[PDB]
Amino acid sequence: SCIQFTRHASDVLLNLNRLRSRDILTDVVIVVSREQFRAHKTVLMACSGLFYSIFTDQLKCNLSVINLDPEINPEGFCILLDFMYTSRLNLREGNIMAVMATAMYLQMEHVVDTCRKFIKASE
Amino acid sequence: SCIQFTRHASDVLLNLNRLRSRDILTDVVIVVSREQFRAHKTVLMACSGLFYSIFTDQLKCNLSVINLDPEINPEGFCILLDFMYTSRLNLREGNIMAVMATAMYLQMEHVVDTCRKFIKASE
């Protein structure tokens, strides 16, 4: 018999992105080649099958630094990290291949789906 | 020029509630009289003006235990904590006064609003 506040989930995510921008309570640095990205492990796990697996691991759960595969593109990661915290995906002709490869590695199925559909439409 | 995934914010919140249920990466215990509630500081701050103030404080940000005012009702807190993690508010005739008082203390304006409207309709 609950009532539901429609905008609550979006409002929570907006405040999680504000915490990220201010570097408040971030507990991990994701290293992608020469670039570093600070984030909250809980948000990463909530968005990515890869981070969900990493941070449920009894040893990796305590690491403050995670190094991604050297084939991962930093811009592609940046675009996906922004997506995690905002629901908005900056998908462009110039970055779609890198975004799709990063989304496959991060196990972000909905992003992979749409990248596949946008690529299929251009061929 | 971003695209947006409509269900993303709700999916994130669902996974944050799963982490709470499994006690994964919880970093605070909220003590309400004889009861204890484990939570994620980032979610508490994102939902509550009171927790936002508490956890941006340079000393309180590092506490693992927060004790609420002894006038706060544990059930009212439990209902609001569930709301924070789900967008669903279990508002009933028997708990509305406790929920509204707890929402005022926690500075959860949208919950206070609706409690006020539900009370006004019954008088």
């Binding site: 609950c2 009532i3 539901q4 429609t6 | 609706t114």
Partner: peptide, 4 residues
């Protein structure tokens, strides 16, 4: 607020 809505009835979900």
């Amino acid at each position: 607020w809505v009835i979900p």
